[PDB]
Design a binder for these strands. Sequence first.
DNA 1: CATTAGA
DNA 2: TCTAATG
Length: 327
Amino acid sequence: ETLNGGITDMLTELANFEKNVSQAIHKYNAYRKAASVIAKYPHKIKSGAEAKKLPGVGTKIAEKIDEFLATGKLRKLEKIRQDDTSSSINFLTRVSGIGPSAARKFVDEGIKTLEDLRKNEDKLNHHQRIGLKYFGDFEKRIPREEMLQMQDIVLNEVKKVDSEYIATVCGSFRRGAESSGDMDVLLTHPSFTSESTKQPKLLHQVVEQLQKVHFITDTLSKGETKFMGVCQLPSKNDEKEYPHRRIDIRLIPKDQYYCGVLYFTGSDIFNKNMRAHALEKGFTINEYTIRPLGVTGVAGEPLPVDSEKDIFDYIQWKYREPKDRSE
DNA sequence: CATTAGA
DNA sequence: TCTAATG
Ligand SMILES: [Mn+2]
Ligand SMILES: [Mn+2]
Ligand code: NA
Ligand code: NA
């Protein structure tokens, strides 16, 4: 966490590098796992050789260790960190709609900056075309003070169309968090459960409203259960317009609400921890349900859930408020 | 890891 | 149909 972190970081740097810039899946994978294991090791790795003892720790990483150990650096790190083409990729990628593949592809075409990107709007896709267009606002955080104003409208339009809906804004937001980077709207409806062969219109109604009002300004991608877009709080009585926000609405079977909600809400460590627990308590957790374990080694059958409580009751745990699901 | 674009 | 990208 702090004793071995050093190694860790260069590792991931190392991994990330092969993974994006180059296309070395393998070495990438290889940087990672050692990266993992070195992480758990209970002592100061004092040498490559000592690390070397570790599984997935090869001659090639042990070597990386020593350069780093003796010299607080690593040329391979410096050489890259430097790499104008390399750096070039990593930057691009921040545009939303841009992955490793496009970054590389774009690069070679000579596009290695935001302006180039602009210059060539044509070679760009809707999604990225958006990402471009709000590049600034997307990287921007979201002051809860806004999360709340956003949340409020969501709920009202949600409600205005059909009284039967049920939305939830999960995550850190929910978790209480001062600022958030995107609002995640969990949504269900009773006329929609596991079987009841959809209702595409279910999502489309809302999306439809939100645009109707102006909250929704763009569609990153609108699917039959997952809409992806952006939204903007109506800029006041002037002098202060609002920043463009990534929004995410999605259709949930009413029969799985609470779990996904419980889940989506985090923290990645809260869940991991609970989920771990229920295992003991004779269960199985996961983004859509909670089933009971059969000694066979396995077993199913999704218990019924009416609120995050059931799930709580179920594993006979303490009702943890969203505020304190920190870990 | 599943959902969506797009080619 | 795949393969990229989001989360
Ligand atoms: Mn794309
Ligand atoms: Mn999100
Ligand atoms: Na080894
Ligand atoms: Na990106």
